[PDB]
Amino acid sequence: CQDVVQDVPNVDVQMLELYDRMSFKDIDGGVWKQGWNIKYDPLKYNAHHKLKVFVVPHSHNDPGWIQTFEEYYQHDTKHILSNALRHLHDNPEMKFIWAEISYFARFYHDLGENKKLQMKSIVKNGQLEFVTGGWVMPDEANSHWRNVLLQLTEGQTWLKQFMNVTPTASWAIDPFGHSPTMPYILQKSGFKNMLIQRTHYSVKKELAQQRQLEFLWRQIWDNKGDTALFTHMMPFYSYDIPHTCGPDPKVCCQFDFKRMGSFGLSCPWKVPPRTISDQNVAARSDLLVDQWKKKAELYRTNVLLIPLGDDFRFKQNTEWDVQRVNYERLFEHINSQAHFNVQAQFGTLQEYFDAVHQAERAGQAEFPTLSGDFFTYADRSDNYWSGYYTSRPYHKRMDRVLMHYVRAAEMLSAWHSWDGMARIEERLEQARRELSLFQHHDGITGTAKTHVVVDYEQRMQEALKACQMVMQQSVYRLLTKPSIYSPDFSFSYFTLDDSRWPGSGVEDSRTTIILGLPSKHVVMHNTLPHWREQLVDFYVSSPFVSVTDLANNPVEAQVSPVWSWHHTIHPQGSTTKYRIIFKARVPPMGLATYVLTISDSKPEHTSYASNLLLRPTSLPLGQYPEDVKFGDPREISLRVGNGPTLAFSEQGLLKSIQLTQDSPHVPVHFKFLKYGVRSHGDRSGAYLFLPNGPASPVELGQPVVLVTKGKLESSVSVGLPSVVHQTIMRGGAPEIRNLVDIGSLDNTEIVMRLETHIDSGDIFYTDLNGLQFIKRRRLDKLPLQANYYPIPSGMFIEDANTRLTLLTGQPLGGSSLASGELEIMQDRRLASDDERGLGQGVLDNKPVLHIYRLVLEKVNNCVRPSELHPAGYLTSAAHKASQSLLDPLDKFIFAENEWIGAQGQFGGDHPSAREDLDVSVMRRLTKSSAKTQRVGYVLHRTNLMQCGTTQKLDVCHLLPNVARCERTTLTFLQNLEHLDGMVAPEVCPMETAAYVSSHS
Ligand SMILES: OC[C@@H]1NCC=C[C@H]1O
Ligand SMILES: [Zn+2]
């Protein structure tokens, strides 16, 4: 295993370094506004050395944006694919590439048999070529790597099953900036090439100048380079025809033949396209070939990629005709005229990449190496696209909930074969597909029209219900004696209980366990492959409850009141229901059963939290044994167990953390601020963050502070404008919860900021797709919005001695705008459109419960990478805190009065793997009729910082009667290695591997 800490990789282009050097000057470069006047030597190409040009027709199909998936399917995409089937069938030299398998599967299953066979034949002969073959073209900023893999697997599994093809070339023309997580997953899924478009105009210019727009993209930690994936960056402003023929859109627009008469479209540069004739073909070819030869100067081979398409193009029969016939006339003239020294034809993306690598192996070119990312994107001037890192934060949070629910449903149901009557495979397919669809670059991004967001939400709501049904049927089968297990596959044996989605302040939909019915069975699931202990809570009808395991051993517990906030923002207690809080111990990938039992009076093993209200009136709590205390606002300090001591201001916001008894009170201040929108010039919208100066403090007033002090759990909640802010303490890193209701504060963005004396300077770390931490440098030469980066799961600052890490349960935008600071946007409400085509601002805000862990640590005794290393790594504590947010224990309440044949535990004999190893995916790949059953596992090993302080996991033996163990691509679709003694080796730090076990 490569060291990923001490050795820095050697790359030609390191994007953090490039950022340090680049001036980012927004110079007017002429007809190529963000470039220069390209020159070429006409003697460069001759009859020996010709320019080979591939014109690659395409149609950008958004699975939701202005319309819903179904609306676009019915009114646009259905007609595009029908016309493609017909026109490619009838025109054997014509070509077309297709990216979104969500739409293609929708279309193919509607076809009659005749058309299905016609479709298979134009795919088999390479006319219609799938590019990437994901369910969608995902967002790369907010998307979790697990969901990027999920949506890739959904699409390619469909393509393999139905078209017998697996794409090896990726096409990503629309995501708003690009992540190295994509080459990471693609290269481990059999890919050989990828293409990207939306990078910063200054980066296009800088790389174009060095012919570095094609590069071997490797991970920031990868010394050896085996992660490398060949990447083509397109050089110009857009993927549309005006910005794909060459540097001058006024010329290129004349070669988009849909922009003439009968179609009702036009060229903004005022020169229309003309039909190619014998009279004008020499003149028109002169202009077009000159554009091609200019574009070719930016690349290292004599093979040129010319995309030909735009948003939902190739819809009409007549569009196919006018583009095809005019280009054929141009090709026929250009190829016949030796003076051009060009061979031009319709081609596909893999045809382009194959020809580029042939040129490379002929000795024509050697490609530069590159590491880093392409955030934050700007398309023009100061228009940085950091807005969508936060836009529609409710659905951003919902994404991470559904991610966990799909993993837990696939894992819990994987243990057994199910009868088709159970509809397990149907429910899991539905859940995978709705979560996969939401990875779209107008889904999780929050860049779709209000009604489309509603469609996404309802699809994810149904996916969540499907996951619950699979999980509760699985738990019933796993913990019921086989002698009794007699399933009704339509019955609810358990109801799920989820404290954090949507949150009791958002949807007051937790079931109260009603005891009098004296006892109630609850079950916890642990999707992680190590033993876990975690506090769990349930709502109960009475404060007089005690906890046992199934063997009747008592379990220490705490009872707190149920609290809700009301607009003055004041708490009110429940007289009716109470929280029972206790520590569940759950095996790796297993289940643990506990029992809640009522009694006459205070039980022996259950304690009662005190409650202090700081502002008064009086708050009855019914049967709750301890009266609520009142006091004037004052500073307060709390410690739970052996854990940190936290001090809070009189506004109830953190001000210091003391790690240990004999350690300093380290300053750590939470503050809420607000950004506005410009009165003059460009307005913030769903995409763009265009602040009118630094954030100004929120006016807190004199707020009400509720302090709940318990043996197992304490918390400080405060009712601020737009935010009920809560700090919860269970004995380790505190948990922060913000109930964010931006209400009708138009043109406002609410930020949460941490202020410390950590001497971070201009350095900070943010993650990419929950997979890796990348070093960021704040640049005062760039505007504030350019220093905003995606925070998909975490961010940290460190000096030589001290680190602060903020872990998130949701992707939000964030930065460190000054030494010692972290900040992260909570929500944003924008009255205006930002002119990228969405045609609305963001005024559909709803209450969302944002969750975090705050980890203050000493790192002076940690082995940290070189100061030249472009990566950072979490500690054990920060990693486990992330895992607690993204993959908590699942909680199940037995629905019925009696559970005959209940068992106490499943998975007690499961191996407890090292803390840096995860079973990201467990998925049964076969239905019950397969005589050979197959189960797929994805194994991810992270890299933790070593600071001073388990059984081997062989996934192929987790199930019995194992006949074969194969290492596969991450999609499970290609066998890479038949494994020795059917033992799945453990993987290197920052490596992800997939394995399929086969069983008798
Ligand atoms: O995905 C549809 C849109 N294409 C142009 C710009 C941004 C995207 O939302
Ligand atoms: Zn798009």
**679-702 b/e with 16+ CB inside 10 Å = b?**
eeebbbbbbbbbbeeebeebebee
Instruction: Provide the CATH number for the domain formed by 910-1000 in this structure.
Output: 2.60.40.1360
Which helix (H) or strand (E) covers residue 611, if one does? strand 610-614
Cα 682 vs. chain centroid, distance in angstroms? 28
List, in sequence order, the alpha helices (H) in 753-903. 876-886
Q: Which amino acid is at 685?
A: G
Using N-to-C axis directions, what is the helix angle for 113-124 and 78-90, rounded to 10°?
60
| Cis preceding linkage at 865, omega within 30 | no
Cα(528)–Cα(402) distance, rounded to whole angstroms? 16
Torsional sign, CA 896, 901, 905, 911: negative
Q: Is 827 assigned to a binding site?
A: no
In the reported structure, the alpha carbon of residue 971 is separated from the centroid of ligand 2 by a whole-number distance in angstroms of: 24
**SS3 label, residue 631:** strand
Reading phi first (left if > 0) and then psi (alpha if -120 to 50, else beta), residue 381 is in left
Q: Is 468 exposed, middle or buried (0-12, 13-18, 19+ CB in 10 A)?
A: buried
Whether 837 is in the pocket of ligand 1, judged by its Cβ within 6 Å, is yes
Whether 66 is in the pocket of ligand 1, judged by its Cβ within 6 Å, is no
In the reported structure, the alpha carbon of residue 446 is separated from the centroid of ligand 1 by a whole-number distance in angstroms of: 11
Tokens of 614: 């700081």
Residues preceding chain discontinuities in the chain with C to N over 2.5 Å: 516, 567, 615, 949
Angle (CA) 173-811-233 rounded to 5° is 20
- The pair phi, psi for residue 605, each rounded to 5°, is -105, 20
Pick the closest to residue 797 from 869, 752, 854 (CA basis).
854
Cα(483)–Cα(431) distance, rounded to whole angstroms? 32
Candidate of 59, 65, 171, 391 to mutate for ligand 1, largest count of ligand atoms within 8 Å of Cβ: 65
Pick the closest to residue 851 from 790, 810, 910, 896 (CA basis).
810
Q: Which amino acid is at 449?
A: K
Torsional sign, CA 458, 459, 464, 470: positive
DSSP one-letter code for 165: -
Ligand nearest to the CA of 686: 1
Cα(96)–Cα(88) distance, rounded to whole angstroms? 8
Whether 839 is in the pocket of ligand 1, judged by its Cβ within 6 Å, is no
Ligand nearest to the CA of 838: 1
Cα(670)–Cα(99) distance, rounded to whole angstroms? 44
In the reported structure, the alpha carbon of residue 174 is separated from the centroid of ligand 1 by a whole-number distance in angstroms of: 6
Torsional sign, CA 972, 977, 983, 988: negative
Cα(822)–Cα(673) distance, rounded to whole angstroms? 13
Angle (CA) 83-86-88 rounded to 5° is 100
Cα(56)–Cα(261) distance, rounded to whole angstroms? 24
Catalytic residue among 76, 139, 174, 256: 174
Whether 174 is in the pocket of ligand 1, judged by its Cβ within 6 Å, is yes
- Which architecture characterizes domain 610-887 according to CATH? Distorted Sandwich (2.70)
Cα(817)–Cα(807) distance, rounded to whole angstroms? 18
Torsional sign, CA 60, 65, 68, 74: negative
Q: Which residue has the tokens 């559909």?
A: 844
Cα separations (Å) of 591 from 471, 474, 522, 745?
12, 11, 10, 45
Kindly give, in sequence order, each residue whose CB lies less than 8 Å from that of residue 295, ignoring residues fewer than 6 positions away.
38, 235, 245, 246, 247, 304, 306
Q: Is 60 assigned to a binding site?
A: yes
Instruction: Provide the CATH number for the domain formed by 382-492 in this structure.
Output: 1.20.1270.50
918 in catalytic set: no
Torsional sign, CA 401, 405, 411, 412: positive
Q: Which residue has the tokens 């358990």?
A: 494
In the reported structure, the alpha carbon of residue 442 is separated from the centroid of ligand 2 by a whole-number distance in angstroms of: 7
Angle (CA) 557-562-565 rounded to 5° is 145
Cα(43)–Cα(55) distance, rounded to whole angstroms? 23
Question: What is the Cα Rg of the chain in Å?
Answer: 30
Residue range 493-609+888-909 forms a domain whose CATH class is mainly beta
**SS3 label, residue 846:** coil
In the reported structure, the alpha carbon of residue 414 is separated from the centroid of ligand 2 by a whole-number distance in angstroms of: 35
DSSP one-letter code for 414: H
Pick the closest to residue 426 from 486, 475, 489, 334 (CA basis).
489
Q: Which amino acid is at 222?
A: D
- Topology classification of domain 1-381: 7-stranded beta/alpha barrel (3.20.110)
Nearest protein Cα to ligand 1, atom 4:
174
Give the atom of ligand 1 at the shortest distance from the alpha carbon of 447: 9
Order of strands across the sheet with 962-968? 917-924, 933-941, 991-999, 962-968, 975-978
Ligand nearest to the CA of 58: 2
Whether 198 is in the pocket of ligand 1, judged by its Cβ within 6 Å, is no
Tokens of 677: 């929108």
Domain ranges of the chain: 1-381, 382-492, 493-609+888-909, 610-887, 910-1000
Cα(426)–Cα(429) distance, rounded to whole angstroms? 5
